[PDB]
Design a binder for this molecule. Structure first.
Ligand SMILES: O=C(O[C@H]1[C@H](OP(=O)(O)O[C@@H]2[C@@H](O)[C@@H](O)CO[C@H]2O)[C@@H](CO)O[C@@]1(CO)O[C@H]1O[C@H](CO)[C@H](O)[C@@H](O)[C@H]1O)c1ccccc1
Length: 490
């Protein structure tokens, strides 16, 4: 088998699966670990966007009541060190101690904020485990299929601790750990004892190449087989090669810009809203994304299923209202910084440069502050910054509630003083089954989000990869790379 070499835009700081949640972690952690329930993005000839859920580490599952799901596990599954997977490892993965309890915050900072209102799991036998919530939750199934739910080995994890585990991970996945050189590379090797489809590459290397031009040059020179995070602008040039091609797809994620609302200038919604109203998204999508990116109608996406609102109007663009809001605000003309880690996000810098011109027309001076990986300053030295959110559930709960809710980082760390009505609705949607009340509450939350502007949604990016034609691999509609039944050579 050939070794697979990947040129990437970044690497996570840890291989602990929850801590690795980002645009750069899942493409690695998806190889090392498995979940109880998995997604088959290729079901019924779908071009990597199928919503179909399939058994993975759990052979079957059944909802027992409004707050519990019982799982029957695959038998004789081995972690990379030969230890058999049991309900003990599954219970530990979803425990108060490791994930959501008070004693877990130090090791997994976002564990509690991203988790459901869990109750301690119940081990029925070696291969049977019930995952449950303290209050009703119809989200257990989607949570278990998500990036929050990769299964860790209890004994090995406890022995090492979360920090050391993140540097030497052990999972049940098709590829096993070889090396992790901080801010440089990750090397994995084929796990030939894998329970599912046998790995088709002998090794996988993820090498950071921060500059996209240098990344493209690496593919051309033959240093990489696949490269990530390109722009629709690179398409014509790569495709002009007989042996190279681009492969892209819209992903279930949105790019945005956000604010440090602890800062005096951003304490009030007025300037935040003015900045949002001046963003001409169609011109950015046309010029930088070649119409391949999509602009959502608010914090509202098709993957939400029953909680997606297809009748929702597009987000308002109003330069004249933006001009009035700036005039009425306390803003003087002082430059406002916008922090960006080069092009960690595809089109981060060209998008920002277009927005700086748009904002100059409304009387707001915004200045780009580009920083290197590991150079993100303390919070009080930041004003505006870019971000993204992967829409990780088949429900509107994610990411409006875990990120922007009362228990989330936007309110707790970034100082968004959310209206009381918003937090009340966040609590309601957590416990309610689908219906008119729940559907209407998400719409009211979307209206408040647009009015308050704690963040400004830009678009769903069109994720662009480039590969050698002799490397058969299709992208999926999520911020990760899938190699199961989706990687072959020659
Ligand atoms: O830029 C990355 O993370 C990004 C991550 O944002 P992503 O858009 O990639 O991932 C989001 C998630 O945050 C979550 O909302 C779910 O959906 C996902 O798409 C996030 C957490 O790792 O912090 C970020 C924000 O720009 O970064 C910010 O916070 C870190 C602080 O330790 C960085 O080191 C800083 O440089 C700084 O830029 C990153 C780069 C290298 C190592 C680790 C993370």
């Amino acid at each position: 088998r050939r070794a697979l070499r990947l040129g990437v835009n970044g690497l996570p700081n840890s291989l602990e699966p929850v801590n690795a949640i980002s645009n750069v972690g899942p493409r690695i952690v998806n190889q090392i670990f498995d979940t109880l329930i998995a997604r088959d993005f290729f079901a019924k000839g779908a071009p990597g966007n199928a919503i179909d859920l399939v058994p993975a580490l759990a052979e079957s599952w059944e909802r027992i009541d409004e707050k519990s799901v019982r799982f029957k596990l695959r038998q004789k599954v081995m972690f990379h060190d030969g230890v058999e997977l049991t309900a003990d490892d599954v219970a530990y993965t979803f425990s108060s101690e490791r994930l959501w309890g008070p004693e877990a915050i130090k090791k997994i900072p976002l564990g509690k904020s991203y988790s459901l209102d869990f109750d301690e799991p119940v081990v029925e036998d070696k291969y049977t485990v019930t995952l449950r919530t303290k209050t009703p939750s119809y989200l257990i199934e989607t949570f278990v299929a998500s990036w929050m739910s990769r299964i860790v080995p209890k004994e090995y994890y406890k022995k090492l601790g979360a920090v050391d585990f993140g540097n030497k991970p052990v999972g049940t996945g098709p590829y096993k750990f070889v090396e992790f050189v901080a801010g440089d590379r990750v090397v994995l090797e084929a796990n030939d004892a894998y329970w599912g489809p046998k790995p088709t590459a002998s090794k996988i290397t993820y090498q950071i190449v921060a500059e996209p031009a240098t990344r493209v040059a690496g593919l051309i020179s033959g240093e990489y087989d696949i490269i990530t995070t390109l722009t629709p602008d690179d398409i014509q040039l790569i495709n002009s090669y007989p042996d190279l091609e681009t492969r892209g797809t819209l992903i279930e994620n949105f790019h945005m810009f956000t604010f440090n609302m602890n800062q005096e200038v951003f304490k009030d919604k007025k300037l935040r809203r003015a900045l949002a109203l001046a963003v001409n998204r169609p011109i950015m999508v046309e010029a930088l994304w070649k119409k391949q990116a999509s602009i959502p109608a608010g914090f509202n996406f098709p993957n939400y299923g029953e909680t997606f609102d297809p009748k929702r109007k597009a987000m308002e663009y109003n330069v004249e209202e933006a001009k009035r809001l700036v005039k009425e605000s306390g803003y003087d003309g002082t430059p406002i910084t916008y922090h960006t880690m080069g092009n960690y996000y595809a089109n981060a810098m060209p998008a920002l440069m277009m927005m700086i011109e748009m904002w100059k027309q409304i009387g707001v001076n915004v200045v780009m502050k580009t920083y290197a990986p590991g150079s993100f300053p303390p919070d009080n030295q930041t004003w505006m910054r870019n971000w993204s959110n992967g829409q990780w559930m088949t429900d509107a709960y994610a990411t409006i509630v875990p990120e922007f809710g009362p228990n989330g980082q936007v309110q707790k760390r970034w100082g968004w003083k959310a209206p009381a009505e918003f937090n009340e609705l966040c609590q309601k949607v957590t416990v309610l089954p689908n219906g008119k009340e729940r559907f209407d509450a998400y719409n009211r939350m979307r209206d408040i989000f647009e009015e308050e502007a704690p963040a400004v949604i830009l678009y769903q990016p069109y994720d662009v990869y480039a590969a050698r034609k002799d490397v058969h691999w299709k992208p999926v509609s999520f911020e990760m790379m899938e190699f199961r039944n989706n990687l072959s050579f020659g």
